[PDB]
Design a protein around this nucleic acid. Sequence first.
RNA 1: CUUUAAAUCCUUUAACGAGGAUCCAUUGGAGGGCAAGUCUGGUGCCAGCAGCCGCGGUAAUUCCAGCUCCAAUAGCGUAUAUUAAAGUUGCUGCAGUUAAAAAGCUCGUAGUUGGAUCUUGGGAGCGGCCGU
Lengths: 57, 221, 83, 141, 185
Amino acid sequence: HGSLARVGKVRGQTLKVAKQEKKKKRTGRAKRRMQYNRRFVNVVPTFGKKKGPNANS
Amino acid sequence: KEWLPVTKLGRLVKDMKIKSLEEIYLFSLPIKESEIIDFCLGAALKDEVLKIMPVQKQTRAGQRTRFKAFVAIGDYNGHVGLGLKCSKEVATAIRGAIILAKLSIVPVRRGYWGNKIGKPHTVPCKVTGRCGSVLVRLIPAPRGTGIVSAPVPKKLLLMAGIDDCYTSARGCTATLGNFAKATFDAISKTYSYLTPDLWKETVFTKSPYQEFTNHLMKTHT
Amino acid sequence: MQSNAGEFVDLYVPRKCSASNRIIGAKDHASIPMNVAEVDKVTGRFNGQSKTYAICGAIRRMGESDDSILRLAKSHGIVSQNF
Amino acid sequence: GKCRGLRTARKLRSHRRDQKWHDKQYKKAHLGTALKANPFGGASHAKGIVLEKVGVEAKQPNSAIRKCVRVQLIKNGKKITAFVPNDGCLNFIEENDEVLVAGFGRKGHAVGDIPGVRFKVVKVANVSLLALYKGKKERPR
Amino acid sequence: PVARSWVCRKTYVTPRRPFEKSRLDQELKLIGEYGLRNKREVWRVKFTLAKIRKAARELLTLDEKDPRRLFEGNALLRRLVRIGVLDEGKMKLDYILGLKIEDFLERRLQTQVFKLGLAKSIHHARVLIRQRHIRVRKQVVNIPSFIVRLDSQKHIDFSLRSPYGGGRPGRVKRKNAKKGQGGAG
RNA sequence: CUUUAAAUCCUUUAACGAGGAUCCAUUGGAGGGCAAGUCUGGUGCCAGCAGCCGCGGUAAUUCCAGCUCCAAUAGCGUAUAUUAAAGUUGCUGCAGUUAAAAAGCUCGUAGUUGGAUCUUGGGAGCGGCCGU
């Protein structure tokens, strides 16, 4: 099934959610400072396995 | 919690009468108690699970999946082990491969590239090791070179306390068991290489089974 | 195994087979340091001092371990030169 | 090597020279057959005119209909199935439109599902197919 | 046939494995610790070291009392002593091999402005240099990468034409003074 | 002002010139290889993704989107020639019982490679039997 008539079926019918208005992200060394301050100087060793940066359930 | 030694050598180790595993490795004594290495190098021993590998045997009804765990162990100052344990669950495989690695730890002789000043930093001579097809060659390098290597032997050589080394693997290195064993066979053979440093004719010191032969008769059955 | 200063730097000096002069690895579990008892030549009794011969696994499985100890004892004055 | 003679330099060299034609990558790049046969004529890209839009059946296990385009080139006049890459981008292509076609990735070899399709579509009527897809540029009409 | 140069080299090398966790770990440590802006900044200090190191190893293949090795050696050592990376006790060229990337970031003028206590943080220090506040012997250095020499270290201070030194008060203070006078009358 | 043939750009410098400092950083990805979500909505072998293995058949960590995260960063993706990786052209340095591979066998001219053997013991000095 699905000859040339079904082109852009899913991209066509996706429920177009508007992109959220966001506070602008720092760049250059400021981003890279923020990154260093997140990775090292904050965290302490936790019991069990270490989780990822984007770890959600 | 309280360790109870069953072998002869383990009983000497516990009673502080053989006082460093340098003395065990002088007489090529098979270590079979796990807590001998936990006693001597206990604080300087770190564990990294190289690979969890599911293996299967085809049965009447489906597959019997067991998990093969490769654990590289060693203090970042003289010693490495390499333990392989296959089990039905992953936690048993890891723990068993930690024990088998500890049992299997060997001392690495490390030498100098050219100038012989300070502490030793590299492999003392070109030493090949292998199992399967995987041939690994470890080569002395100058100070600050790092371990120029694939990420597996790089992980064992770091654990061996070798700062600087050139490698050169051959054959199917993608099979990790062979590659990890081959690079462990390569650093095994450092104190099995007869350099001119080791020509001074041997002074045979007394065995720990002779030095404390009168102690072992009473201390246990 | 000196550095430039002179410090003995390697962590143990491995034994070396008395027959072949080949060093004995930390896990050559077929090695054998055999102690041969000495004799007060007038009495024929154990003194307390003894000769120590090491052999690597390789020679033992080669089957040459007895003839090596035979030469080492003959080369120590234990076995008769006649033999 | 096998002849380790001190005066074996023409035997060692002429042997390598002869055996180097059994290397597939070498023979391809050092004969005129692979280049004279190449539709692009040894170019990175090429512009051609869209003549029909084709629905190519995916090789198998994964069974979808890949919306390619049959393209007649300008330089040679040779005919090419060029894959229209992104989702629902066959709507951006009409008949008799100049398309910049590129290779697919594997240097004159079919890539994944699509059988006998070696090329993809980059630009349509001097407008990039990404800009149309994202909607940063509109089609010139 | 134009009267131009064309001579140019790269100052960095991108690493072979792009996503080594242990490399991304250690390089971001170096960036955050010495307040750099990108991985190219670590990679170029690494490449300056590797050049020095390659030169040093090339000299160690040559025999002692080789006039090339003595001249070139003493020059490479004197160059490292000047920039304050190698000590005058350690000017034998087998100590260049025992030398790390951190020792060159220590001589970075951003990190010296921090460690000489005329900046609050490593990130403040870059702002000061990049906003042409500091001078090195009555010469305003705008650029934080300035490898400070051992000769030229104690002469680092604020520019005479900067309000943190004896300078004209800046744009914000002068507007806030005009606001304070505008409000009153 | 300086620059310059005359200018421009930089440099120098008055005066202006920053709070969501809207003076708003992108380009590719987030199954593994390969750093980074088994998050929600839509689709349901369709649309599509996918260099490779593969993801899609109504719980999609792989599609199309929202959020978030990762990488490099004023740059980043793609196509193609090419180098390393390739000890997958092998002089260093590969292979040829069974994976691709030793001529059916022998002779044979170029080619290539070729056994051992023909100067040794001293005379002289310095440094602490040895070394120049």
